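Researcher: I'm preparing a figure for a lab meeting and need a structural model of a single chain. I don't have an experimental structure, so a prediction will have to do for now. The sequence is pasted below. Please return the structure as tokens so I can convert it later.
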Amino acid sequence: HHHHHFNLPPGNYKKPKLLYCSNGGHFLRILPDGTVDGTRDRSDQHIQFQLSAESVGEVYIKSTETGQYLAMDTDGLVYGSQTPNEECLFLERLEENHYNTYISKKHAEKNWFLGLKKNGSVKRGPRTHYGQKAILFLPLPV
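Model: Understood. Here is the structure written out token by token.
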């Protein structure tokens, strides 16, 4: 269990999704160059993701458009990976009996999450923590 709770979201990985950030109302986005951020633009073409489960509670967040994997580096920087690797795995959990959160598996011991600031910019691993709005996500149908 990676020393973390085990409350899981009720959803499934049948179809792709949009990852809506409660904090600023931004959709998670991966640009072709590998840049990760958030945009309020629903018509954007790089905001669609396909999640897959590696193991119960561990997922991959792959961009349907570019095929890039959401990933978090050794210094807590979120980036788009060409290939799937250990830095691409996230522990997908329920939060506040409602939202989804993604903790970097590799850095789970430090509670490094995926998160978006109100300004649409992505957060560095160490800057995130339980209790922030930046970490709460809502997966929406595309």
